[PDB]
Enzyme design. Structure first.
Site, mmCIF file in Angstrom:
data_model
loop_
_atom_site.group_PDB
_atom_site.id
_atom_site.type_symbol
_atom_site.label_atom_id
_atom_site.label_comp_id
_atom_site.label_asym_id
_atom_site.label_seq_id
_atom_site.Cartn_x
_atom_site.Cartn_y
_atom_site.Cartn_z
ATOM 1 N N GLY A 38 -3.105 2.352 14.089
ATOM 2 C CA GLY A 38 -2.477 3.500 15.117
ATOM 3 C C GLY A 38 -1.186 3.060 15.960
ATOM 4 O O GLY A 38 -0.465 3.895 16.096
ATOM 5 N N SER A 39 -1.347 1.704 16.407
ATOM 6 C CA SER A 39 -0.303 1.287 17.168
ATOM 7 C C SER A 39 1.067 1.333 16.426
ATOM 8 O O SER A 39 2.155 1.612 16.931
ATOM 9 C CB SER A 39 -0.435 -0.329 17.670
ATOM 10 N N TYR B 289 -4.248 6.718 25.246
ATOM 11 C CA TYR B 289 -4.305 5.483 24.571
ATOM 12 C C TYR B 289 -3.375 5.851 23.106
ATOM 13 O O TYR B 289 -4.092 6.608 22.345
ATOM 14 C CB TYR B 289 -5.606 4.858 24.303
ATOM 15 N N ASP C 125 -2.027 12.506 18.136
ATOM 16 C CA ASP C 125 -2.671 11.321 18.001
ATOM 17 C C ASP C 125 -4.225 11.484 17.555
ATOM 18 O O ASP C 125 -4.957 11.532 18.310
ATOM 19 C CB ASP C 125 -2.416 10.419 19.105
ATOM 20 N N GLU C 126 -4.402 11.642 16.108
ATOM 21 C CA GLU C 126 -5.713 11.583 15.771
ATOM 22 C C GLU C 126 -6.061 10.334 15.125
ATOM 23 O O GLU C 126 -7.124 10.447 14.107
ATOM 24 C CB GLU C 126 -5.761 12.564 14.882
ATOM 25 N N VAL C 127 -5.689 9.126 15.457
ATOM 26 C CA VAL C 127 -6.048 7.828 14.995
ATOM 27 C C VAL C 127 -7.828 7.747 15.341
ATOM 28 O O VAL C 127 -8.411 7.205 14.645
ATOM 29 C CB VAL C 127 -5.542 6.688 15.841
ATOM 30 N N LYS C 128 -8.100 8.385 16.527
ATOM 31 C CA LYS C 128 -9.698 8.201 16.786
ATOM 32 C C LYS C 128 -10.669 9.456 16.274
ATOM 33 O O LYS C 128 -11.537 8.987 15.746
ATOM 34 C CB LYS C 128 -9.692 8.052 18.479
ATOM 35 N N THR D 97 5.978 -6.092 5.582
ATOM 36 C CA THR D 97 5.480 -6.289 4.377
ATOM 37 C C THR D 97 4.627 -5.741 3.657
ATOM 38 O O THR D 97 4.732 -4.995 2.362
ATOM 39 C CB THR D 97 5.435 -7.781 4.111
HETATM 40 C C1 LIG Z 1 -7.365 3.080 18.372
HETATM 41 C C2 LIG Z 1 -6.225 4.160 18.428
HETATM 42 C C3 LIG Z 1 -4.805 3.827 18.605
HETATM 43 C C4 LIG Z 1 -4.377 2.494 18.138
HETATM 44 O O1 LIG Z 1 -4.974 2.098 16.868
HETATM 45 P P1 LIG Z 1 -5.140 0.461 16.757
HETATM 46 O O2 LIG Z 1 -5.530 0.452 15.288
HETATM 47 O O3 LIG Z 1 -6.116 -0.244 17.548
HETATM 48 O O4 LIG Z 1 -3.575 -0.104 16.944
HETATM 49 C C5 LIG Z 1 -3.964 4.840 19.018
HETATM 50 N N1 LIG Z 1 -4.309 5.915 19.353
HETATM 51 C C6 LIG Z 1 -5.666 6.313 19.483
HETATM 52 C C7 LIG Z 1 -6.134 7.907 19.954
HETATM 53 C C8 LIG Z 1 -6.748 5.410 19.264
HETATM 54 O O5 LIG Z 1 -7.873 5.871 19.338
HETATM 55 C C1 LIG Z 2 7.982 -11.198 6.739
HETATM 56 C C2 LIG Z 2 8.464 -11.911 7.983
HETATM 57 C C3 LIG Z 2 8.000 -11.553 9.089
HETATM 58 C C4 LIG Z 2 7.358 -10.370 9.629
HETATM 59 O O1 LIG Z 2 6.195 -10.016 8.907
HETATM 60 P P1 LIG Z 2 5.771 -8.505 8.442
HETATM 61 O O2 LIG Z 2 4.530 -8.557 7.328
HETATM 62 O O3 LIG Z 2 7.015 -8.001 7.826
HETATM 63 O O4 LIG Z 2 5.220 -7.894 9.828
HETATM 64 C C5 LIG Z 2 8.194 -12.357 10.441
HETATM 65 N N1 LIG Z 2 8.810 -13.612 10.206
HETATM 66 C C6 LIG Z 2 9.360 -14.242 8.976
HETATM 67 C C7 LIG Z 2 10.246 -15.367 8.833
HETATM 68 C C8 LIG Z 2 9.023 -13.399 7.848
HETATM 69 O O5 LIG Z 2 9.416 -13.666 6.747
#
Ligand SMILES: *Cc1c(COP(=O)(O)O)cnc(C)c1O
Ligand SMILES: *Cc1c(COP(=O)(O)O)cnc(C)c1O
EC number: 5.1.1.15
Lengths: 422, 434
Positions: free
Chosen positions: A108-109, A135, A224-227, A281
């Site tokens: 969600g972040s 949040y 934001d419907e993550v939760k 990635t």
């Molecule tokens: C948990 C949540 C997030 C963030 O998700 P993460 O997976 O913890 O980054 C964002 N918005 C809401 C409403 C959440 O409940």
């Molecule tokens: C791929 C890479 C990242 C970032 O990883 P993600 O999975 O894309 O978040 C950071 N540093 C280096 C050197 C990388 O090769």
């Protein structure tokens, strides 16, 4: 060495949100199995991530098959069938035919971060509306605006400016908008039930009206419907309860059924405004994608929104029964299996009972129950179990919760002080 | 209607880094399987995420057992066994000075961001050293101290200091020793308040900057200047870590140990997973500070373990060192035939091949590089290019890639060089690339 002691030695405090010494080695359905042998009923579901529970056959089948024959590992540099199938599936569930597209994330972040970055890039409008106590994630990009118009959340339990309707918040919004140039605010970020704020369902009609005002100003509505999304509210999407359809939908936690997976459903113009712009990635990896597909398939197959609706009423009915016996209970709220129970020192003063809340979850843990508290005031118990949870498990959890209230005295403030919490 | 068109219809451009219409429905070993069943040799390995290739039995067994009986879904509000076991296994393998702890993430992006946020929180020193061309991630927090083109348009940390990377092929100020860069560093540190820099971010082989191996002995000298100024040294081994370099950790080649190690990509073997190995003081300075719900989830953690146990069991560092020589030998053989090949570099199964218009002046051949990989794709070989100039072929195959795969790959690569003029400007223009 005990698992919890091993944890303290190997893993840094930085990511710890600990309230009691829960140390897990297993899980089956809605039950967590501790190292020490005991089963516990999970009313948390990993903050709602464990939507189908633990070891659900559909998740095992989808994940195992995917691991055995993965369509690569990414959606960045290659198209892959699982991710495309899930994307089309998500577009099918949303009223966005021809208009909307999908962006895949880990969380969600990163999803909220991506929505904001894309909105600014696409529209040049960097101003944001968000609610106090919101949040949207725990990274620099998602806390950026989790320039800024902060509004109170329309809480029926604690009105803003002595107005239970919430209409004083819409008036505030009107003034804030007029105070700053037209076309300066690109997005409003909403939670259709506030999470960290304390599982607050807004007063009826507020969000529809809120969305109207936004559209009048060319402001994109981000839901934001993550939760609270994907079946958990008793409908597939929580906004279905609210008489509006957002421009952007953000999904996470339970979407992955235990695997890291999030998604942004956004107008094509927003997501096609640049390439190679918001990417990591393992975004769109076929193992997370297949997990997400299984979650959506099971939601339809097993009518999980109706299950959530039915089981939530039962839970909240249960909680009301406990309220006759325990004065600490001031407000029971929620939709489906996203429920909150606010604990107050007096029901008229509505003064928060923070200390008692902390002891209550600790006690509940000792009795074999996993439940956490949230809220600006640390006094709201959150209930977000697997939508898969059994009617039997609910009734058992209700007895244990009753027991927990009756035994708060059995927990000292020094046992509480050992766990840093929030 | 076909998979690639369906992808354009359902998925936004925002996260696409496409170079050709590769559309995958499966995978086996070092091979990707397209919708029609055509097999391709994957020399990219998903930018190195596919450390153990596709459908490896250890990943399959680890993941299937964890899905069947998962230890919750988090390390945030619970301790779980898969995550702690993985944490101690990572800790055992790190030759640290002092005592260290683990932070778990989804990606190298969240890991780099979290490492930096923790340093600033622990020390109050917000200044940062990174290298021009550095890729540390695509999140707001990790882009703040990055130097790549993806991060070019993002908010940079105040107190960001950028140094040229020690590139043997294109030495800064024509000084091959790298002394001019350490000299520049010295002038930078004194134009800034003493004790203001908390961190120095290092890629031991620079990835997106063009798979660049620095001059021998430079990083040790760099680390010494940092340690003498109270600056913590952060080694970003997301791309080039865990056996890939011919050693378990790429810093084993450079004669220094970092204060903090960042892991990702290949760590998860195809599932999202990253880790920070940092001194205890840094990771214990705050609680509930840098966290995402599914961090330390037991399924990603089970795969992480399968990766490290396989690295150990198959001696994958030694495999990578040999398969890497085999690959770079074959590329040297291609150099004798194709004048475009200006430089071949790398350690183990992290290799770069820079293509230039002229071998003497080394002007970057951007158009040919794009045509090359497009043609390679058509022939059944997956390989991408990187670099500030888009002229560096990157080879980061599954570490379990067979000798036969490499030979087949070299033959198709040979053929792609001979046949690149087959690829039209219009065909390439259809792909936004970097
Ligand atoms: C948990 C949540 C997030 C963030 O998700 P993460 O997976 O913890 O980054 C964002 N918005 C809401 C409403 C959440 O409940
Ligand atoms: C791929 C890479 C990242 C970032 O990883 P993600 O999975 O894309 O978040 C950071 N540093 C280096 C050197 C990388 O090769």
């Amino acid at each position: 060495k005990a698992l919890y002691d091993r944890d303290g030695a190997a893993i840094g405090n930085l990511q710890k949100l600990r309230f009691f010494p829960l140390a897990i080695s297993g899980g089956r359905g809605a039950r967590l199995i501790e190292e020490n042998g005991r089963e516990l009923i999970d009313l948390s579901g990993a903050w709602g991530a464990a939507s189908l529970g633990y070891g659900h056959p559909a998740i095992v089948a989808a994940v195992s098959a995917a691991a055995a024959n993965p369509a690569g590992a990414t959606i960045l540099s290659a198209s892959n069938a699982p991710a495309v199938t899930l994307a089309e599936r998500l577009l099918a569930s949303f009223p966005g035919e021809g208009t909307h597209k999908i962006w895949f994330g880990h969380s969600g972040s990163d999803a909220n971060e991506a929505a904001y970055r894309a909105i600014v890039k696409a529209t040049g409008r960097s101003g944001v509306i968000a609610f106090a106590g919101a949040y949207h994630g725990c990274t620099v990009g998602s806390m950026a605006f989790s320039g800024l118009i902060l509004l109170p959340y329309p809480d029926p339990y604690r009105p803003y400016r002595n107005d239970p309707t919430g209409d004083a918040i819409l008036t505030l919004l009107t003034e804030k908008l007029a105070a700053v140039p037209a076309g300066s605010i690109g997005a409003a970020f909403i939670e259709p039930i506030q999470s960290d704020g304390g599982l607050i369902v807004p007063p009826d009609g507020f969000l529809r009206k809120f969305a109207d005002i936004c559209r009048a100003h060319g402001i994109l509505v981000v839901c934001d419907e993550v939760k609270v999304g994907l079946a958990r509210s008793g409908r597939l999407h929580c906004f279905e309860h609210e008489g509006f359809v957002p421009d952007i939908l953000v999904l996470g936690k339970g979407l992955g059924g235990g695997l890291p997976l999030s998604a942004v459903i956004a107008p094509a113009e927003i997501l096609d405004c640049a390439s190679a712009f918001a990417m990591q990635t393992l975004h769109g990896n076929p193992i997370s994608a297949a997990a997400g597909l299984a979650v959506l398939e099971t939601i339809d197959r097993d009518d999980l929104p109706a299950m959530a609706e039915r089981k939530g009423r039962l839970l909240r009915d249960g909680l009301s029964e406990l309220a006759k016996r325990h004065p600490l209970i001031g407000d029971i709220r929620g939709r489906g299996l996203a429920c909150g129970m606010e604990l107050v020192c007096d029901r008229q003063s509505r003064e928060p009972a923070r200390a008692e809340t902390a002891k209550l979850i600790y006690r509940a843990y000792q009795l074999g129950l996993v439940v956490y508290y949230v809220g600006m005031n640390g006094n709201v118990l959150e209930f977000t179990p697997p939508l898969t949870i059994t009617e039997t498990d609910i009734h058992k959890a209700l007895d244990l919760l009753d027991r927990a209230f009756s035994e708060l005295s059995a927990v000292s403030n020094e046992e509480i002080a050992q766990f840093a919490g929030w």
